[PDB]
């Protein structure tokens, strides 16, 4: 039943993308991308990007952010010490959501 | 049994009482041998010290009252240093200390339970001053309002308590509370029983005025 | 018409009654026993006595009524008689009983005093009636205010039923 | 001499008429006397200068005593009738007439009625006194009634202020609010029993 | 003593003795002519007894007005003067003193009514003074009643949030097993006192 | 009391002679008066003179005075006092005098009675005048009913305090009850939170502990 | 390669959204569950009846931001 599993997993990612607004994608070079959609009240397609990669010491560091962000060091320390990433992804979601209204 | 044993070292032994807050440390005589190798009376106790790990700054009134009561029982009877100088009498002095500890812990639970559920039993205030207890019974079920000042002591509840009823509103004589105390036996759970008895006789039996 | 006429008249009749006694026989007796000093002059002396004694009554009565002030009191008596002649039944007279004599004159003013006193007491009664009515109304008013305050404290106490049901709902751990 | 008190006629004339009669009689007999000696002395006036008078002066004195007594014999008898007329007819005050002060008193008032009226007036005096005392007590009661009415109005104003303050926040009706609170608490009991039993059955398996 | 005159208790005996002794004048009167004897004789005899009588006094009364000796008339006169005195006294009594006591009693009535109306102001201690009502007491009632009402109105709105949360959580409990009872769904899926005592 | 003439009588009475001697010399003097009033009628003529007449008159006067002296006889020293008698067996004017004497008694009693009455009245007036310048309050009136139907107002003013105390009781009871309500709402919220805790923990249990480590390789 | 990547991105998605969904119901409506910091909550709405923006604001505003 691999086909059904993969099809609903793609459907789950798609419903996050449309219903929730977030889609994740692993790309080459040990990098991952978070794509944010349906935030701006006027322009719903407006992409918001941030790609994160891994250093030589297994740490979270956002490789790039479109638009850029500021709060990276504290979340890096948080995931390095308390090995938690739920709060990090939730907080970057909160920041990107707040990005529309300054 | 609310007592825990931590260690029996060649230098000292440690008991933890009431949520480990009271550290009864037995500092023995400094030797590399114990009572088995030595004589049964040679194992003298240098210091029966009572470390207080309870932080009174953030402690609630129940903890302050229970710890003050235990320490008052200690200081009024510190003659352990005169009477408990051997490891043979150590278990029995521990047991008799645990008895007052258990009574005082149950008492603290009683003040907590009453502070939570007073208006059900008409107990709208518990004010603790040093080692006293002020139970404020006040209701218009029989047009009554009075404070009972139970001078709680470490001997509670194996001794009757001096009950000085300072009347506020209504006609209550010393005989009324005296009969209340007599009908409530001097045993465990005494405070809750006396509160319930006051509620029953003076406020539930009397018909609600309409 | 006046009293003085009759008073002076019947006494003159008395005078004639007096002088008629002896009279001519008296004159004959005295003027035959003596009968001679000087007949004309002795004749004259006898009548002088009669005239002087028959006038001395008149001057005496005049003095009695004048210096005794009896003419004025006689006129007053006539006025009283003409005023009170209407009543013919036996009129009461001062009987010498001091108490009734006092009462007959002290009754009227004491009577008016008693009248004025009852006027005062009736005014007091009139005012006291309204005072009692006001106090009776105030009694009802205060009992009524007691009624609202008792009803209000009963209403606040009526909450006790809901507290009891709330206590029953909040079950103690058993 | 009269068998009577004369308490009335002298009461108005100021003197008993018997005194007037006795004065009249004494004065008149004195005058009769004096004129007897006057006339006999006038006769003697010619006897002093005329000797061998046919009639001795003492004979004139004798006949003069005779004349005096003979006038007296009828004079007293007629004066009796004069008195009987004066004291009863021409100076007396009849019983059918009322004197000025008698007119002042006039009507007879019974002394027993006076005693009853006096006890009545004194009793009405003490009644007036107790009525005025009752007036004073009633007025004091009125003052204290005003005071207690003011206090009652003050506490009723307190009641109104308490109700207004309680309604100010939004708890318009205490009884209804507490009843609805009890009902909501009962529903909360229902859901909390549900959650407790569900947790208990889930905590095991 | 001013009375020198002679006092006699008998009159008939004295007159008879005078008549008997007058026989001396009779004999001397017989020493006159019979033609003129009678006038001169009567002269002498009347002068005799007249002079005798004029020297005597009948208990101080005049001879011509003398009367029977049964009772003294001076005593009767003194009594009669007293009787007139008392009668005129009672006459002046009924004249003036009733009016005077009338003038007295009217003044007494004025005094009585003055005393009566002066008694109208009467004050007796009957008022019951009491301490003023306790302002701080009713103020404390006001304050804690106000805070109770505040918190009660707050609870009335806070509790329904607990109600709706409980209903939602009951729905969550309802949905939980079926969601965990589903195949691909799990495929995707795969003492308070201790707090009180600071340890 | 007719008396005239040469007189020399009445008031002119000697005091050295007894009343019998007094009347005797009165007789004697009257005798000379008779002699001198009888003498002028006689006239002197030849062989006729008055010596015999005057001598016989003088002898008669001597006989008269001797007769009076003989008549003055009486009991020894009996003239030192006087005599007084009278008969009062019965009369009617005496009865009138007696009865009018009881009238005197009646008026004498009336005098003192009137004096006592006027004195009592005037002294009562003076006493009232002096006194003017120098229980019953509730009864005896027509409105004793409003007085004796009086409730105790102090009891009402005291029951005011009882009402206030009852409100204190009731409202502090309400305070305690609603505090208990808060203490139960907090406990219910704690129950909700803690049950959410283990349900979330059980959901997390099958989640990858370190999914990113498996993600990198 | 496909299976592990898919299961891992599924776990990452569940960790991120903290939300499980319902698929057996019709796609015209959305049923699900959210594991928020407060009491766990249901999710019952109509996906095809409201605009995506409003529903997204509804879910992402229920997350406790205070």
Residue numbers in the entry:
A (entry chain 5): 123 to 224
B (entry chain K): 2133 to 2342
C (entry chain B): 32 to 205
D (entry chain A): 1 to 205
E (entry chain N): 33 to 222, 264 to 272
F (entry chain D): 112 to 245, 256 to 338
G (entry chain 4): 131 to 196
Sentences from the paper on this structure:
One of the outer layer main components is a ten-subunit assembly comprising Knl1C, Mis12C and Ndc80C (KMN) subcomplexes. KMN network subunits are in turn distributed into three subcomplexes, named the Knl1 complex (Knl1C, consisting of KNL1 and ZWINT), the Mis12 complex (Mis12C, consisting of DSN1, MIS12, NSL1 and PMF1), and the Ndc80 complex (Ndc80C, consisting of NDC80HEC1, NUF2, SPC24 and SPC25). The KMN is highly elongated and docks on kinetochores and microtubules through interfaces at its opposite extremes.
The SPC24/SPC25 dimer, two tightly interacting RWD domains, caps the complex near the C-terminal tails of the Mis12C stalk, engaging in tight interactions with the C-terminal regions of DSN1 and NSL1. The RWDC of KNL1 docks against the lateral surface of the stalk, approximately 5 nm from the upper end, engaging the DSN1 and PMF1 subunits. It also captures a C-terminal motif of NSL1 that is connected to the stalk through a flexible (and largely invisible) linker. In the KMN structure, the two Mis12C heads are closely packed against each other. Comparison with a previously determined crystal structure of the complex of the Mis12C with CENP-C indicates that this closely packed (closed) conformation of the heads is incompatible with robust CENP-C binding. Specifically, the strongly positively charged DSN180–112 segment is predicted to bind at a negatively charged interface between head 1 and head 2, opposite to the CENP-C binding site.
